[PDB]
Symmetry: C3
Subunit: 533 residues, 3 copies
């Protein structure tokens, strides 16, 4: 086998150049395809050219930052020194300018829009005051992260809701997801036949969850998700000054679920402080996964609003966590350790797809079993309350009626008008007690009722609410927080970090309340930026 | 934060009085609601008043027993001493009176009712004799528990089947469960659509199991189930003189499945004796779980009879366990240890509901798969026996035909008339060989056929049986005793108590036979108390 | 209890004779039934008589071989010595005779049949040459197993495809399975109602898998499967000279899935060599399981061809494993250790049935979820490729179009004609990239399209292929070899043998390629033996 030996020696001698040449040939072929498509027709091939240009730009940027980090840091250093030297007097000027800008924006936009947006701003202030008053360590509050998170939320709201470029970009991004969720019909029709639409939810919606889980697993294998998570987490860390671990987990929670987000920093969980653990739990409670976004879109909820709320939740979660439970210890983990995210054990893309598919079985089973149990309990409770109510000549007593009054003040502070606050209170109660699926189902019912165009009041009962109220409800309901998800979170986090069982249990309720408050703050900003039609 | 410190000091100083005052205010509000409902209309608010009165009575009784236990015991002591002093001669008088009462009841009721009830009594005697003859230690039999269990069964049968108060109470209780099982339709319609009735069993019956599991978990969290179990177990322990652990497990098995009832005494399992272990297994085999009651009621089986058999099974299970495998060791566990039941790790009611919901997944999956496999095996066996039978010009040979003859003597001793004994034998075989679900499905088929009113014989084949025979079959079929559950029972019990693997395996078959015999004894009593229409 | 003591003493004294007498009485009863059936009518009772005769013959044969092994070996020894003495010169005569026979068969059959069978033979030669060239140790090849496996495949093909007895036997065997898979409808109708056919795959096909899993578990409990596996494994071991462990695992893989076949030799896995491990993995990848045979038959794939491919795969798998990764170590395990197969922990037949039923839950769930995910990914990829293709005025670009050209050379070497090679390439790609379920679904689509009789070309697109091409595709697609199962295979094998994790990972890809090559070799033989209609 002399030929085999010679071939092996050749491969060993120049292994690096051979694979590099192969990759270069593949890249050249792709570029040739792109240029040929552009030559044949440019308007038709524009999106491919844009994607290629942005990919090349990001690759070059990443390479340059990796290679010239020290030089750039040294070049930036003198400016930082001068700014530190002049900061003692420049801070007052900067703060005064920011306050003046806030006042001018309020006076010239919010007052023009109407009273409800001013009420939204007041509700944001009140939620922040309430969070501060019931803080774990009111005297140890570091105010930089809170104001920076609120400012980042406000900037995102202005960019996405008050500008044509951002509005078009997010409308397009939402429209793409609707196209993407339709592909699961191919599998659903085969597995469940052409009559799979006879049982809409079980045989059409859950397959969307399965497909999205599979796609998320494939993306995680490809490493794009860690790239985006690192970008957003670095932005938050440099702006808000938060710890690398909590910043990374908050950025990840935008896409990944509550129970699978901490796995990004699993090795370092035992050494985190109490504040970081509370922030991790708050971020988990304040966002929704990407697996269960197609399910919400299928009901009829706006995709653009869901994406915007998911993006805005992370800074809100971090700010509310820092205000509610400020840091009183020294963080141990560093940026390099936090940013490295151990990828899963998948040998190839198809194995990653199969692993993502397999994991969805438990998720889709629980999603249906919990819904069955909660809807049965709701029907039983409504019947029991009607039975009790009839003894006072009030057989209309129900869970919805009680929620309409208990949670109305929370909806009013978010900027919902008086009439629609009682309807939003019912959704708030549904989310708080059972889960977000039950609340989004009712929200989709109301959206469809409005879109039909029928009478708004029948026998004195309001049938649907305004579109701004619907948007505010969508922002408020975008989370994983409910009184029934505390046990699974505690169990999973203890399983990842058994030594920290005592600490995990202590802050879980505060993290859940912080998540709800962060969702309400995002809803407050959305309400204060939207206009009354 | 001086105000925060002062508030914390105030809370710490008088924590006990603050929560007590809050609870008192809640109780006062509830009482105000009840009295207002009664004032506005009394006949309409009667059940609420009754529930409040019984709850207050039980709370006061429990408090008094807890506080004045020593005083009551001391007050009772002299009477016990006098009774012990005179017992050597009073025992013959008491036993003679009981025997005379039994004879008088037989002569003046059973003979009047007909021959079949005398046959039921003879079958009860024969089953007890057979249990004694094949006993593990025939010379070590303690006869108090056997006679006390039989007497308690007879008293329960007289109270429930032969008196208007008990009959009305149990009919009402059964009717309430039928209303309760309808609530799962709310979840079933949403998850599976409005066409969920196109697949009746999978999309309507199993959700009832899920909802019942959720409700049972919520009740166990609330602690009412332990209260009722403790009451019934104390009654049995004081009457039959059984060990606290076995009494508690028998009482619990009325509501809880065989595989979860032992969890009530999990810490003390390693120290139980062989007789207690056999009694635990017999009780598990002799009763059903509350989660599957809804499916049986949905098939069409009488709810009142199911509840009565479930209640009567526990004393029968304990008596048959004690007779078949009497105690030859010294029990180690005491009443206080047996009665304390470590509750689950649920932080709030909604978490308990979600945990109950999640557990039901495997239950329903196993039920569906087992039914599919058993029905396919039944069809294959029937086809194979028809193929074999045709070689003797008897192509009618089938599993049902063989069962009609093999198990007919067991049905006849239970008091079923000659014609219907062969039909009950088929149900007995179905239960013995596959499970109680198929036997109850066939029983529901027969009940529906009778209720239609069609011809009783078509081409010489009997289509349905009498209602007394149906009741006797319902009593006989109430149990999880089948050859296929021996493996799972042994696995679960060994998992709870690994050290006792050798002992668990030894008595499992005897416990299964004891459970079947206990079910047959309950059927015998039901038959001897029912009348021929 | 003197009577009980005497009975126990009697039972202990003559335990062996009592059970032997009972078994003899049962056997006498069975023989009486058989003889009576034969007397009443012989033609009607013929199959029962045949089954009884074959069972008696096999029992007597097994007893004689067990009892007289040493005597038979000694009697055979002198002939072996003479053959060894004369082998140095007789080997050339034997090899020349075999080569002449091969040449004569080629010239007088293959040339007559047509060019395509000669191309199949050339493809077999090319596949063997390619396997040799890329071998792990090309200089350590032991050529006995390769030639013996190829000869055994050729003999099986001649017996089953070129003789009336074998053809009738295998057609009958396939027809029996079609009858057997119909029994699951009894359970499916009850669990899913009479409308279970509204969702054909989920509510009719998976229950077949459940029933087949249950039947396989019952057979494994009964010990017939080990009997057959031992017979086939001894045949392969004596002919090919393979190690006992690899022979036993290859024989078992004919009926058992890749993930459960190694459990037959679980205790001895840690001491196997690298070559044996590679052979185990190749055998697992080169065959299908009996649980999924029913689904494939339900789709419309020929049952006889599936059975023949499953039988032929084992020698092909072993030969390709030995050629690709030859043995360079000393095997430690012996025949006696390999042949003993520790049975499962099932106390009775019904418990075995329930355990087989329970295991099927994850199998069917994973099948359904993987199918949904793969079909959704296929639809998304087809849409993306159409979007990319339209930029070159070729919107017809698709995954199928690319596969039709990428894998066409593999199909052509198997003997498929030029036109149908492109269609077989699509099925090859489907199997390689997602699984064998989708490829078989497409094959059933094509088979139905051919069986309808419509036009073969519509607008220049071929609709269906010849029946010989369908048979070759059926042979080629019989295997669990796909990129997505590498992870689960490695995980399961490491779980069984944690110490061998490093060795398991190294050879998994080579074992998958060897399995694919073995499937292609079986397809090559099937093509070279079939005729063009
Ligand atoms: N279980 C679950 C959940 C869910 C949805 C999506 C996920 C996910 N990606 N990872 C873990 N959980 N998860 O369903 C409820 C309603 O949507 C929620 O409260 C979650 O508890």
């Amino acid at each position: 086998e002399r030929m085999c030996g010679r071939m092996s020696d050749f491969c060993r001698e120049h292994k690096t150049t051979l694979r590099y040449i192969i990759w270069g040939i593949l890249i050249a072929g792709y570029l040739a395809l792109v240029i040929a498509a552009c030559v044949m027709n440019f308007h038709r091939a524009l999106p491919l050219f844009v994607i290629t240009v942005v990919a090349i730009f990001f690759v070059v940027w990443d390479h340059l930052m990796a290679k010239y980090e020290s030089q750039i840091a040294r070049f930036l250093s003198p400016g930082q020194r001068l700014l530190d030297s002049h900061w003692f007097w420049l801070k007052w000027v900067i703060w005064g300018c920011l306050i003046l800008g806030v006042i001018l924006w309020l006076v010239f936009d919010t007052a023009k829009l109407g009273q409800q947006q001013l009420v939204s701003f007041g509700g944001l202030i009140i939620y922040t005051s309430l969070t501060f008053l019931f803080s774990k360590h009111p005297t140890k509050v570091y105010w930089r992260p809170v104001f920076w998170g609120i400012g980042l939320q406000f900037l995102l709201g202005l960019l996405i809701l008050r500008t044509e470029p951002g509005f078009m970009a997010f409308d397009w991004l939402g429209k793409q997801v609707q196209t993407f969720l339709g592909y699961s019909d191919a599998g659903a029709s085969f597995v469940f036949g052409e009559k799979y639409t006879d049982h809409f939810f079980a045989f059409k919606v859950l397959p969307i969850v399965i497909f999205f889980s599979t796609v998320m697993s494939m993306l995680y294998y490809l490493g794009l998700m860690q790239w985006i998570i690192r970008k957003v987490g670095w932005v938050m860390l440099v702006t808000m000054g938060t710890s690398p671990v909590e910043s990374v987990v908050a950025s990840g929670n935008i896409f990944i679920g509550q129970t699978e987000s901490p796995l990004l920093v699993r090795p370092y969980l035992p050494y985190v402080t109490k504040s970081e653990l509370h922030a991790i739990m708050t971020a988990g409670f304040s966002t929704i996964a990407g697996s269960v976004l197609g399910a919400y879109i299928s009901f009829g909820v706006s995709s653009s609003h869901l994406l915007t709320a998911s993006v805005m939740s992370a800074p809100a979660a971090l700010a509310i966590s820092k205000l509610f439970w400020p840091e009183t210890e020294t963080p141990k983990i560093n940026l390099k350790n936090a940013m490295k995210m151990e990828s899963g054990d998948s040998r190839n893309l198809l194995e990653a797809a199969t692993q993502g598919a397999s994991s969805s079985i438990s998720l889709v089973a629980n999603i249906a079993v919990n819904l069955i149990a909660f809807l049965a309990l709701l029907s039983f409770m409504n019947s029991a309350l009607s039975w009790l109510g009839n003894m006072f000549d009030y057989p209309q007593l129900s869970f919805e009626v009680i929620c309409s009054y208990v949670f109305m003040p929370f909806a009013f502070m978010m900027g919902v008008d008086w009439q629609d606050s009682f309807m939003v209170a019912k959704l708030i109660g549904y989310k708080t007690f059972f889960n977000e699926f039950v609340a989004y189902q009712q929200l989709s019912k109301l959206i469809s009722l409005r879109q039909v165009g029928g009478p708004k009041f029948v026998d004195g009962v309001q049938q649907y609410m305004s579109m701004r109220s619907e948007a505010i409800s969508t922002y408020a309901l975008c989370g994983f927080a409910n009184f029934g998800s505390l046990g699974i979170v505690i169990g999973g986090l203890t399983s990842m970090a058994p030594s920290r069982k005592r600490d995990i249990t202590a802050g879980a309720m505060r993290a859940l309340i912080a998540g709800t408050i962060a969702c309400f703050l995002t809803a407050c900003i959305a309400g204060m930026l939207t206009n009354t039609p």
